[model samples]
Structures are given as structure tokens and as C-alpha cells.
Target: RDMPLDSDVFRVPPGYNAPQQVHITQGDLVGRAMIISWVTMDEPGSSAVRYWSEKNGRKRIAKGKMSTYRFFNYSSGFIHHTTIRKLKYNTKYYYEVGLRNTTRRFSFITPPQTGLDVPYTFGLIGDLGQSFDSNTTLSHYELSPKKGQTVLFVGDLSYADRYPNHDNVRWDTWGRFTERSVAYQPWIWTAGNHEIEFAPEINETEPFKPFSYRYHVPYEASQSTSPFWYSIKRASAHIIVLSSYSAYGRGTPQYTWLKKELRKVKRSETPWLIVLMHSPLYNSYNHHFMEGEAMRTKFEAWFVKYKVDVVFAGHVHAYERSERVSNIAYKITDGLCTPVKDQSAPVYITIGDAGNYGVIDSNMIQPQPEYSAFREASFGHGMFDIKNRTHAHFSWNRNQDGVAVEADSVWFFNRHWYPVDDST
Candidate 1:
């Protein structure tokens, strides 16, 4: 049953090559737009995507710009990204992505346009390295009954730093591993500290070179030229993706950009604002505890001022959640909240246990206040169900259990009671 070993080892017939790293993300749900991104190794010409609705059954194809970027002094591959515009809200669309000689089929459901009620689910995880543990997390996601509409990769994706030469093979493998789920659903991403593998050098010259090419983000929709940071509206909620590797102190570009973006969000249209970042502003894990304290001190006020609903982060390689509190100076708030005078601490959750070589910390810092609802050292991801404008549900699943065992579950309700104004 064995075939010849030299028979076109990496070659495939035209239109038959397997597409890898295929993922989608909300471009600007306010306008019913979504972006599709994927990669191919051999194709050299242009790339295009064809999509059509199952309801109307009309085929439409969009052409995107094709480009190549180098990583670790090696020409990585071709990256294709195209934004589907003017999409009908809440409609299902079948699509295919490929270069001139190859194509792979997939599909996604666009979030409803503004002022429409829809129940959507999101799978959130981070610190997923290219290891067997990472595969377990992906398998757990694949078997989950929720079938999340989208995935939020908070950060620390490949762990490329562990390898000296920065093997592009691992990136390719990781892409193939998640293509099964990502091809069918939107896999939104944010930058993590580990993403900057050649830090201090890469940071100065080619910050986010590999990240910018591997996936497509809605930079235009978010009014950002850099894919590292952006914002998108998904069903009655506004999600802001921030860059942890970038500057966040006073007068920094990111701080300025965030302020402008947050101010522009109409809380009446999207009552909930959730921020996703790579590193956690507050974490109890011994590894990266308080790693982002400086950034938090600079930005926490704005979040409280804007009544941000929640903040999701990774990089601690563990699971932790905090209760509602105001103030950044409280001793018990070391990993939970602080005693800042007049601001409500955003509900912070860390799910960095996606899978890596590291183990989670079991020790709890002193003054374990009741506000710290839950903390665990298990490999898992989170499923968030945005029920409506005023309610949302969050659940965490442990990979060892096969199904999300509801490690911590909560219903974020009574949002209407909060004030919404731009005068912060």
C-alpha cells in the first residue's frame, strides 16, 4: 500500500492544496463586515475569496491583496486577507479561500447589524504553545457542545521563543491544528509578551512582523493601521483588543488610541464593553503576577470611567477570577482588586492554562478575600455566552475532563444600572 516517496512530496493538483491557518474575525459589525485571513506556502500569484449566502444562493467573490513577509531571516509564506463588506446581518454565508491554484471551503455567520438581538458564544484561551498540551486544548474546544461562534486568542500563541532558530514549522503545524475549528468560525487574536520572541531587537525593527502576517485583523474598521490593536462590535457588545507588548503609559500612542476608541463607542448601542489583552493587569500566579501593574495603573481608570463590563487576559498560565470591587490599593486586592478611591474594578479573569510546558501555581497569596471567587491550576479555556444587552454567561472547561466542567460560572446582569457618559 506504500506509494513512491518521490512522487511530488509537497505538491498537489491545482485547486486541491490544503489551506492552513484559516481564520475569521469581525471587521466592523456596526456595518455588517467581516475579515477572512489564511496562508499558503507555494502559491506566488494573487489570492481571492468567494462567498455566498445559503439563503439567497448568490455567489460573490472578493479579491484581496497578496503579500509575503520574512520571519527569522526566512521567507515565511503568502498571507491573504479580504474584507467582506455590506453583508446581510445575521445571515449564514459559505465561503472559500485560496490562491490562484488552490482553494479550501469554509463558512461563517455574520453578527447582526446594530440594534438587533442575537445570542452568541465565544471561546477564549491563551498561552497555547505548540505542544501536545496545546492539542489537548484544541481537542477540548473541538468537542465542546457550545460550538462557539468565534474564538478569542488572548495572546502567547506559539511560544516561538523556546526554539533558537524560531522554527517556522511549528507555526505551520499550529496553524494546521486549529484550521479545523478556525476555518468554520472566527478566530480573533491579540498580541502577547511571548509573541515578541526577539525582543529588544525585534521590538525596535520588526515589532509584530510574524504576528501581522500570520492572521488578518480589521485594522481599518478599528481605525488602526497596526493589527496589534483594534476594536469590533459583536451583537450588542463592543470588544477592544489591546497590545500588551506596546507602550501603555501616559502620553503613549496606545493610551491615546484607546482613549479615542473607547470614547467613540456608544454605550447605548453597545451597552457592554469587554477588553481583551495579552498580559493580565492583576494575577496571583507566581510566574507573572502583577506583570502588567504599570499598564493597569495607567489604563484602569479609563476602564472604570467607561463602565467596562469585563477584562480577559492571559500570560499567567493559570485560571483566576475576581468579584466586583472598586479601588486599587486594597491589600486583599493584590491579585483581585485595588483600593483606588472611586472606581469599580472591572471583572478580571485569566485563562492562560490553554497548554504549555509550564504548570499552574496552586498557592494563594495572603489575604485571600472573598472577592476572589475562584482560582484553579488546570489547563482549560472559557466559553462566554452573550445572552442579551443586560446579561452574559461565562464558563471555564478543564481539558482533563474532556468537557467544560463549569469550573467557574457567572451571569453578568443588571448592566442598565450603570451610568454611560463620555465626560470621563
Candidate 2:
């Protein structure tokens, strides 16, 4: 059951103009900075954040900036973004946003210092629409014993585009729906297809208008020219976020930027290199079969060269994991395409089945391909735990169980730490 926007849970508090949809994201590659963002409906209140930790007895105020956008006949509220820099790692900070009549307080914990030996956990979710199943997934995730410090969100948030009238208020509802957990821990966001609300027939030709007005990422920290693409280093992992919807072919801006970014990654410091995007390069489901073939062909070589440990993606609306496989080997036999296992290739995982009020991508290809280690059509979330530089654990939890049970799991060995050629 998809929840309605007029539901009591999504309603603004007594103070209508109060800060709502408050959330945070990593402001820098390391744990030294954070970005606190919120929205005000009736008026543009003071754009500032007052935060303090146990280390500091007094509060410190950081002034932020407010912005707004228009889409068709809908005018968005005042969006505020405030960055707090030079925060110490592994500490909890209490923060307050809005002024006097429209104030709200929340707290967040910063990750430990960045290092190869550091351990960290991340939550993976995508295409999470505000459906009954979506709530179940979130509940299970919140109850996780080893919940992720940050969420590696792939894309397709809210499914507001599914609305026939292009209900932009769905964006606000989705924001408030995720605030419970997202406000406490950072959810690294990437744009998805649903975010592109380009309905030219209604004169709403501007793409990503609603999305850009709401969520803001730290694109500048990694020197990314576009907010859609960026990178971040946390613990023993170097995460490169790519934009599948943007131009990524050879000689494109994203391609050129990725070339430099990959070159700058220091494997010695961050042994686990990971890539996240909205679409999957390798998939078996019929819903989006071969949708990412172009991107895979263009970027697989680079991913191999950089020794990326894993590639996480959304948009499939299902769960599928591929073994260490690269380009498919063309051996036409019985109408089956074989994928060769290559040690250099990264493990591909599609955990897009967070939850949506639409049809599940259950129609799988015949005779399941060899590369797909496991697959299931269910609403669930994944937890990626990096224990150290060389080893990590990944588990997917299905929501139908009514409990947080590890339905599928695999242990990953760091690709960057392995010798280029073990053949003697």
C-alpha cells in the first residue's frame, strides 16, 4: 500500500514553517566535515545550524544558504544547506536547525578516521518508493545489528514520476518519509531515472528540477564539475559515484573526469575501491535487460584497470549478484551467452529491490547465466561491512521474513590487495 501525502505522519508539525525533511551527508571525502540540510514550507527561516558535541560544552553556529525552485505550477519551499567543517572523527554531535518557533534538534555520529585498516559498514538501497514494502524494508534496516554508518543509495527515489499528474509533492513526502533514519546517518545519494521529471507536454521541460531542489551532495569535495558525479574516501574504501543518466561515453566530461579520479586513487591508503551508479552493467532480469550494455562497454576496462572491488547499482527492481565476470565471451551455444570469470573484474551486485508499488522484476532469463551467483525477486536491503583492508562481508536481508535475517551473503577479498598475476 503506497502511503498518501496527506497521511498524518507526513504532515508538517504545529509550526507549519518549521524545518522538515532534515538530513545530513558527508561534506568531505573524510569524516572531517558534514552537510546538514532541511526545508521550510511557509517561509525562508534563518539558514543556520547550531551543533555541539561532548568535547565542546558550548554550541557553534554555522551559517548556511537557502534556495528554491519552480516546476510547472508548483513552487518548492526554501531549501537550506549548511556545512560544518573540521569535526573530529568518531564523535556524536547534537545539532539544531530553524529558529525560535520553527526549531528542531537531531544528532549524528561521525565515522572513524579514514585509513586502510579502518572498519566501516554501509547500507545499500535503491528505487525505494513510499510503499508498504518500503516501510518494511526500512524497519528491518533500522533494526540491523550492524547497521551501516552511511547508506550507499543508488537511485530512483520516491517514484513520484509514476504519478500520472506528476505530483511533485511526492518529493516532499519521500523526504519526510526518509528523515527518521536519513537525518541521523548520511545517505549518499545519486540521481536515478525517476528523478528526471521531464514532462515537456506540460511545459515542465527542466530535468531534475525537483531532485536538485531537495537533495545536495558534496560534489565539490572531490573536484567533480557536476553534482551528479563525485567520489569519496571513507575508512578503507574509495567510492566513485558515476552518473548513468549523464554523458559517460569516451571523450565525455564524465569519462574525462573519471579518468583523472581513478588515476588519483591511492590503493595503498584505501585498499577497497568501489563504484556506484544508478543502472547495472550486468543484469539477468527482463525488466531492464541489457539496459546498461553501453555504459558497461565504455567503463568496464577502466574499472578493471583500477581494481575496483565491487560495483553496486539500482533500477532493476530486483536482486542479482554476479561473480567476478567482465565482458561476455561470444560462444554461441544453445542460445546461451557465457560470461568469463576474470580475477581483474569487479563483483557486480544489483540490490534495487528496496520497494516499489509497481510490478516486481521477476521474469528472469531462461537457464540462469553462469555469472549470476544468486538472484531473487523480493523487497530487501543490503549491508556491506568492510572489516579491514583485505576482507569484507556483504549480506542481503529480505523483508517478507518479518525479521532481519541474512538471506544471502558473500565474503569479498580486496581486489587491490591481490597480486596482479599470481601465475608463476
Candidate 3:
């Protein structure tokens, strides 16, 4: 953002090349495709991408959509959405994104194929903002020894939707701030309340306009009718991204799509089944205790039925990991949702403390320490390192300044995994 031209206009400088907020996302075809999204000061005539692989000696170009963004009375200069397809899994590629001229160069490695038993790493952060402490967390993420091959950001990305209204400028600021690391790997994101950007001004028809414009998730590829929810696969992991703001009750479109996706997972190919969303189902924290209660009542049984290995959520600004639990009570007042004994329920972990504008929640751990295996109020992120199909290590990183310390660690193990009905 720069100074106003005549004390009445707030505008960005006009240019392209060395683009702003350059990043990659998973496309409809996870292993064979990747989507490149970024904003330029000005719109290129034709949104296009040019890429070359080490194994291939030639370059290829694909045209994408470039549209001027205008929504809810907010102005988003120019956003480009392009997809690079027909690439091999676990392979690296170099690419430049632009129209006729003025391009930027970046590289990325695709996740492994579903049948491969190769190791894969991913970074997990939730409710990230553009604050100083957020910078610390992201800095540590960038400099860490294992920053993960990709990032799984749960929600509340920009914190620009509130203030009684949303602003495109704040969203741009956050995008530019996270560009360094975001461009390095694929960022698989799920929506939160902040992303809804729902307001009376737009009425019921227009919602989540900004998020839909800026981010690209593989909803269509996964047979999800809506862009807010979808699933993707890595070497040994099947990751499902759900929407907390949508109708998740049984029989709803999102719920039906989720069930279909879950039923299609092949445990033999991808042993790990992880689900991510913006709201927590088994949170013990005082804040958002009932936030996702309705969703849990309708969807919790589905997770148990399919044997989802782990569940990740945000909207509660702290780190809390739960022991294996199934049939957890959704009503907080209904005697603290307790995990069923000796059940292989999905281990719920909330990684929302990745530095946000809203300060951390103070006070002792809520819903009692019985429900939460480990709880902390520091600002940091989590790393998921999967060595094999049966085992994966999860480590939480807490950033004080630029340096980070491992606050918590655990090994999620699935011995006799079951392939969903549609998957195997």
C-alpha cells in the first residue's frame, strides 16, 4: 500500500514482474496438477503459466483466468488463477506466471502419488494473522530445518473480514507477508468464519466472495459441489478439508459430499486419513466450546464410522491435543464431552495459536484437563512428518521471537487401517 494520489484515493502502484503474494495450491488432480494464484498491480492480458521440469527439456504454457476483483464494495486490483497440469508426482518444476510479459519465477515439488509409501512432510497452522508475533511464527516456519513440503492452514488467515466490514487491502498485506514461504510449497487451506465475509450489505446471495476469488481448493475434483470443502491425497495420507461455515448436518450437500469422499478413501494406498476444518469438535477451551457443537452432533459419527486417524481445527486461539475419542458429547454443559474408552477415534488437535490479532485466551484450561491431553497458549505451528503409511510424527513449534522450540510431540499410529467402501 502507498500514499494517496490526491488525499482521496487508496491505491497500489501499477506494475507486474516479481509478483505479489505468489503461491501454489492443490488442483482438482492432486498428484498431477497444481494451481498458481497471485495478484499483480495490473491485470495481464491473458492469464498464463509457463513451466519446465528437470526431466523435460522443453517449456509449456497454459492459459488461465485473470479477472478484476470487486465484491462487497471492496476492490481487489487483479488476481490471476492458473493451473499447471500433467506433472509427475514427487517431482520438482520451475515456473513463471504472467500474461504476455512481466513474469515471476518460482519452484515447487508435488506430493507423492497415493500408492507410494514415500515420506511426506506438511506444516500446520491455524488462524494466522499479519501481526508481529505472526511474523515470528512464519519466520521460524521459513527457517526451520523441516518446514514441511506443504502447508495446511486451518482458517482465519487475514483477519481482515471483521472491523464491521471486510477490506481487500488487509488481505493483500497478509498475502504479501506470507509469500516467501507460501511460494515454496503447496498451501492447502480450509475456511473459517472470517473467510465467510458475510454481511448484510451483500445479502444472502453473495458470500465468501473474497476467499473464493483469492484461493483455489480442489472441490470440483473431489466431487464436492461447493468450493469450500474438498479432499486431497498425498503419498500415505488422505486429507479432507471441510467448511465450518456451511451446512454440515447430515443430508446437507457438504455432509453428503464428505461422506462420499470418506467412503472413497483407500487405506491400502493412503493409510492416513486426516480431516481439517475451521471449528473444533472436541475442544475443552472456554472460548468456542459450543462453537462447533451442531456440526459435531451430526458429523462426529461419520468420522468414527470411517476411522479418520486425526482431525485438525482452529477458531480456538491456542494449541490443544486430545486423546483418541469417539462419541464425544457436543453439548458443553452435558458433563464435558468425554472420549469413549478404548476407541480408535480421530485424535483432535487445535493449532489455532499461529499468531493472530485477537490475543490468546487467558485463564486455566477449560472443560478440565481430563479432555485435553496437552494444552498451551503460545503462538506457533505444527509439523506433520510421515515416514510410512502406518506411522507419522506430529511436532508443535512454539516461536518466541524468530527462534522456535518444540512444545509438544506425538506419534499417530494406525495399525490395521480399513479401506472405505468406495475406496478399496
lDDT winner: 2
How far is 136's C-alpha from truth in model 2 (Å)? 1.0
Whichever of 1 and 3 has more lDDT, that candidate is: 3
Q: State TM-scores per candidate.
A: 0.87, 0.95, 0.89
Candidate 3 segments exceeding 4 Å error: 1-18, 201-205, 328-338, 365-367, 401-404, 415-424
Q: TM-score of the candidate numbered 3?
A: 0.89
> How far does residue 384 in candidate 3 sit from its true spot (Å)?
1.0
- Give residue 238's lDDT in candidate 1 (0 to 100): 79
Q: Which ten residues in a row have the lowest lDDT in candidate 1?
A: 1-10
Q: List the residue pairs that clash in candidate 3.
A: none
lDDT of 1 at 169: 54
lDDT of 2 by residue, 1-424 (tens): 6877676657675685889999899999777788999999888888889999968758999998999987767788899999999888899999999874578999998888878889899999988989877877888899888877899999999988888757778888888889999889999988899988889987887778788878888898888888899998887888999988889877888998999999999988988898999989999999889989889878887888777889999999899998888764444565534567788888999989999764479999987888888899998999999997878889999987746589988888888775343211
lDDT of 1 by residue, 1-424 (tens): 1112232321232454445677777766473777777777665545678899989988998877667866655676777778888899888899987635666778887776664245678888888775566767877887778777778889977766655556555566566566677777777788887676664543335666676677777766878767788888877777899998887777777887898998898867776778999888767666776778778777876877777878899888789887654554535546745443233556788888888654555666765555565788888889888777767788899877757477678877623434232111
Cα lDDT over the full model 3: 0.76
- Candidate lDDT scores, in order, read 0.72, 0.86, 0.76
Return whichever of 2 and 3 wins on lDDT: 2
Poorly placed runs, candidate 1 (over 4 Å): 1-18, 29-31, 199-205, 328-343, 366-371, 402-404, 417-424
- Each model's RMSD to truth, in Å? 5.5, 3.0, 5.0
Model 1 residue 45 CA deviation (Å) reads 4.0
lDDT of 1: 0.72
